[PDB]
Design an enzyme around this catalytic site. Structure first.
Site, PDB file in Angstrom:
ATOM      1  N   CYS A 263      12.881 -13.262  93.589  1.00  0.00           N
ATOM      2  CA  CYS A 263      11.930 -12.460  94.326  1.00  0.00           C
ATOM      3  C   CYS A 263      12.045 -10.988  93.872  1.00  0.00           C
ATOM      4  CB  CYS A 263      12.235 -12.747  95.801  1.00  0.00           C
ATOM      5  SG  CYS A 263      12.789 -14.471  95.882  1.00  0.00           S
TER       6      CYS A 263
ATOM      7  N   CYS B  77      30.018 -10.257  36.382  1.00  0.00           N
ATOM      8  CA  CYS B  77      29.571  -9.567  35.189  1.00  0.00           C
ATOM      9  C   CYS B  77      30.771  -9.023  34.442  1.00  0.00           C
ATOM     10  CB  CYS B  77      28.656  -8.417  35.586  1.00  0.00           C
ATOM     11  SG  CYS B  77      28.216  -7.326  34.237  1.00  0.00           S
TER      12      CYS B  77
ATOM     13  N   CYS C 129      26.992  -2.337  90.727  1.00  0.00           N
ATOM     14  CA  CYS C 129      27.145  -1.266  91.747  1.00  0.00           C
ATOM     15  C   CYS C 129      26.618  -1.552  93.172  1.00  0.00           C
ATOM     16  CB  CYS C 129      26.482   0.017  91.240  1.00  0.00           C
ATOM     17  SG  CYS C 129      24.719   0.114  91.583  1.00  0.00           S
TER      18      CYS C 129
ATOM     19  N   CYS D  56       9.063   7.492 107.474  1.00  0.00           N
ATOM     20  CA  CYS D  56       9.194   6.036 107.499  1.00  0.00           C
ATOM     21  C   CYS D  56       8.884   5.543 108.908  1.00  0.00           C
ATOM     22  CB  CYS D  56      10.605   5.602 107.120  1.00  0.00           C
ATOM     23  SG  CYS D  56      10.814   3.810 107.065  1.00  0.00           S
TER      24      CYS D  56
ATOM     25  N   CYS E  69       2.192  -2.670   8.852  1.00  0.00           N
ATOM     26  CA  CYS E  69       1.508  -1.739   7.959  1.00  0.00           C
ATOM     27  C   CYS E  69       0.273  -1.180   8.674  1.00  0.00           C
ATOM     28  CB  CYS E  69       1.093  -2.448   6.666  1.00  0.00           C
ATOM     29  SG  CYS E  69       0.003  -1.496   5.586  1.00  0.00           S
TER      30      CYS E  69
ATOM     31  N   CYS F 111      22.644   2.743  88.473  1.00  0.00           N
ATOM     32  CA  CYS F 111      23.679   2.833  87.463  1.00  0.00           C
ATOM     33  C   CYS F 111      23.147   2.574  86.059  1.00  0.00           C
ATOM     34  CB  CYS F 111      24.767   1.829  87.789  1.00  0.00           C
ATOM     35  SG  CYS F 111      24.237   0.131  87.544  1.00  0.00           S
TER      36      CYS F 111
ATOM     37  N   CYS G 218       0.837  -1.210   0.000  1.00  0.00           N
ATOM     38  CA  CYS G 218       0.000   0.000   0.000  1.00  0.00           C
ATOM     39  C   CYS G 218       0.875   1.264   0.000  1.00  0.00           C
ATOM     40  CB  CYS G 218      -0.873  -0.018   1.251  1.00  0.00           C
ATOM     41  SG  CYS G 218       0.096  -0.284   2.750  1.00  0.00           S
TER      42      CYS G 218
ATOM     43  N   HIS H 142      26.483 -17.443  50.907  1.00  0.00           N
ATOM     44  CA  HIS H 142      25.617 -18.138  49.955  1.00  0.00           C
ATOM     45  C   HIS H 142      26.189 -19.500  49.493  1.00  0.00           C
ATOM     46  CE1 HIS H 142      22.504 -18.741  47.047  1.00  0.00           C
ATOM     47  NE2 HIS H 142      22.155 -17.471  46.944  1.00  0.00           N
TER      48      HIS H 142
HETATM   49 ZN   LIG Z   1      -0.254  -2.469   3.480  1.00  0.00          ZN
HETATM   50 ZN   LIG Z   2      27.385  -5.487  35.381  1.00  0.00          ZN
HETATM   51 ZN   LIG Z   3      20.715 -17.311  45.428  1.00  0.00          ZN
HETATM   52 ZN   LIG Z   4      23.672  -0.670  89.656  1.00  0.00          ZN
HETATM   53 ZN   LIG Z   5      11.334   3.208 104.860  1.00  0.00          ZN
END
Ligand SMILES: [Zn+2]
Ligand SMILES: [Zn+2]
Ligand SMILES: [Zn+2]
Ligand SMILES: [Zn+2]
Ligand SMILES: [Zn+2]
Ligand SMILES: [Zn+2]
Ligand SMILES: [Zn+2]
Ligand SMILES: [Zn+2]
Lengths: 145, 286, 76, 76
Positions: free
Chosen positions: B184, B116, B192, B215, B43, B173, B18, B135
């Site tokens: 307990c 690579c 310390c 106290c 085309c 500390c 064409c 690996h």
């Molecule tokens: Zn054509």
């Molecule tokens: Zn590469």
């Molecule tokens: Zn792998």
């Molecule tokens: Zn301590």
């Molecule tokens: Zn006390």
């Protein structure tokens, strides 16, 4: 072993006399002790039995100490383990089993409800001392003879 | 032109020939590269060859090549080459794009470690990830775990949360320990020599040592606690503890004659025991 | 006759060839100019793999055509 | 094989280990170099508590991995 022998000799020579302690059999590192309930405590008239196990490196580590008689106490559990500072973090090689027994007797006479091992017993001791005394007396009659 | 209706004085293309004007010849194919893909390099008027299959029919592209060479600006004439040769590259070989640069190569080996030619970096052909010797002889999901677990910040948080759950930091500390259960409330900092509570972190004082005023029991072994502390709520049974919030195999370190050894609780469970289940609810209130 | 060969790197080279040149000959020219062994070379034209025994004219490769070079990478 | 152990203090140590080494063995090496008793040692890797009877390879602990050391405390 030499240190344990020296302590035994001191104990026997100058009997503490509320308490006793000595090797169970042929093993010097395993002892049994007795403490008489302090006078005017709920435990009066009771005789309470304890087990003492010395470590191989004693006196540089503390003995393991436990009640084998049941007792109603803010600082002592059903397994007979004891909350006492010198038995744990405050031990020094200057301390002796005689002193430990004295301290435990003092503890029986004067509990520390603020640093309890058995929360409910600590609560009753703080909130109803008369009830606490009554129950401690019942346990003394029940398990201390 | 078929598509835009001229009849003036090139387009010898398969199954057809064409007429097409050169202004709209460029544009059809420039679009078909920059938007449609290779199958659509056809085309415009007939729509014919069928470029799903036939390789010798792809001689068609040889003939196209010259036409696009000058008509298409080289930007899009590049894309014709890029699209067309990259097409066959990605047709089932052991062809790889390099995992770091834009290069590729036909990797014909019986190996996973693959460096690579161009950027000289190595990667696993399978997981297409940078190759460390960890690996070596390990499956891909294995190595990729290692990476993830071993990367700091994961480690930092995996620890940080561990101490969230299981830690205990001396209040004086500020040294961080890992809590050994079975003990307990009243602790001794091994650095310390301070004494303190597990719940509130307020201190403990031996006999004749409490400094804080008003106290009452200074004579005894004790420490001061808030209303909040496990200390006080441990005295409540499960029953009361529960409704506030509405509105045994735990490992203790246990002493034996020659040292300490970890063991489970062993206690009857009313799946935690009385005490431990109380600790459960107490923690949630804070 | 001159033709172009471009690699994925984007580097383009110019070869002097004749239509009768085999694909083998063309790989030998690339080796001469680029140092790449023929056994490591895959050449493509308009998406067709060019086979060693055939010629440039077999593939309708004209003046100024561009071939694509892709390396084949070989273990021991 | 060499691995690292770091404490909250920030101090890092290097251990010579093999993948077959038990966690117990590793604590014994830390005791050798640092004086810390094994009973006081908690080791963590990637947030996992390392248990005494297992090995480094059980936990996928590779060359150059970093373990975390935390001291243990029991109440008194
Ligand atoms: Zn054509
Ligand atoms: Zn590469
Ligand atoms: Zn792998
Ligand atoms: Zn301590
Ligand atoms: Zn006390
Ligand atoms: Zn037109
Ligand atoms: Zn408290
Ligand atoms: Zn429990």
């Amino acid at each position: 072993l030499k240190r344990i022998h020296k302590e035994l000799n001191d104990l026997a020579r100058d009997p503490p006399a509320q308490c006793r302690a000595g090797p169970v059999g042929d093993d010097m590192f395993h002892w049994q002790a007795t403490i008489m309930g302090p006078n005017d405590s709920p435990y009066q008239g009771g005789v309470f039995f304890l087990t003492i196990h010395f470590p191989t490196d004693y006196p540089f580590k503390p003995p393991k100490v436990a009640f084998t008689t049941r007792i109603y106490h803010p600082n002592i559990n059903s397994n007979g383990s004891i909350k006492l500072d010198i038995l744990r973090s405050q031990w020094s090689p200057a301390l002796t089993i005689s002193k430990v027994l004295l301290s435990i007797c003092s503890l029986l006479c004067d509990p520390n409800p603020d640093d309890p091992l058995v929360p409910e017993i600590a609560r009753i001791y703080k909130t109803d001392r008369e009830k606490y005394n009554r129950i401690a007396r019942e346990w003394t009659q029940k398990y201390a003879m | 032109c078929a598509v835009c209706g001229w009849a003036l004085p090139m387009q010898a293309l398969t199954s057809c020939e064409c007429t097409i004007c050169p202004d709209c010849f460029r544009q059809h194919f420039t679009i078909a590269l920059k938007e449609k893909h290779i199958t659509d390099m056809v085309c415009p008027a007939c729509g014919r060859p069928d470029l799903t299959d036939d390789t010798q029919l792809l001689s068609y592209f040889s003939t196209l090549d010259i036409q696009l060479r000058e008509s298409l600006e080289p930007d899009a004439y590049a894309l014709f080459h890029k699209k067309l040769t990259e097409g066959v590259l990605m047709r089932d070989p052991k062809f790889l794009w390099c995992a770091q640069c834009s290069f590729g190569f036909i990797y014909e080996r019986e190996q996973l470690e693959a460096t690579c030619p161009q950027c000289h970096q190595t990667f696993c052909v399978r997981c297409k990830r940078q190759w460390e010797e960890q690996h070596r002889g390990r499956s891909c999901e294995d190595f990729q775990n290692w990476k993830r677990m071993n990367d700091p910040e994961y480690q930092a948080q995996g620890l940080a949360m561990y101490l969230q759950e299981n830690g205990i930091d001396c209040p004086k500390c500020k040294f961080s320990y890992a809590l050994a259960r079975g003990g307990c409330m009243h602790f001794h900092c091994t650095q310390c020599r301070h004494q303190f509570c597990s719940g509130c972190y307020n201190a403990f004082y031996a006999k004749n040592k409490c400094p804080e005023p008003n106290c009452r029991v200074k004579k005894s072994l004790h420490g001061h606690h808030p209303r909040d502390c496990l200390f006080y709520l441990r005295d409540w049974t499960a029953l009361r503890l529960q409704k506030l919030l509405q509105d045994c195999r735990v490992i203790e370190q246990k002493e034996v004659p020659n040292g300490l050894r970890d063991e489970a609780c062993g206690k009857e469970t009313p799946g935690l025991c009385q005490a431990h289940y109380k600790e459960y609810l107490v923690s949630l209130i804070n | 006759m001159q033709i172009f060969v471009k690699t994925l790197t984007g580097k383009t080279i110019t070869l002097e060839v004749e239509p009768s040149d085999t694909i083998e000959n063309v790989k030998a020219k690339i080796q001469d100019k680029e140092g790449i062994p023929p056994d490591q070379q895959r050449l493509i034209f308009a998406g067709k793999q060019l086979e060693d025994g055939r010629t440039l004219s077999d593939y309708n490769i004209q003046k100024e055509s561009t071939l694509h070079l892709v390396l084949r990478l070989r273990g021991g």
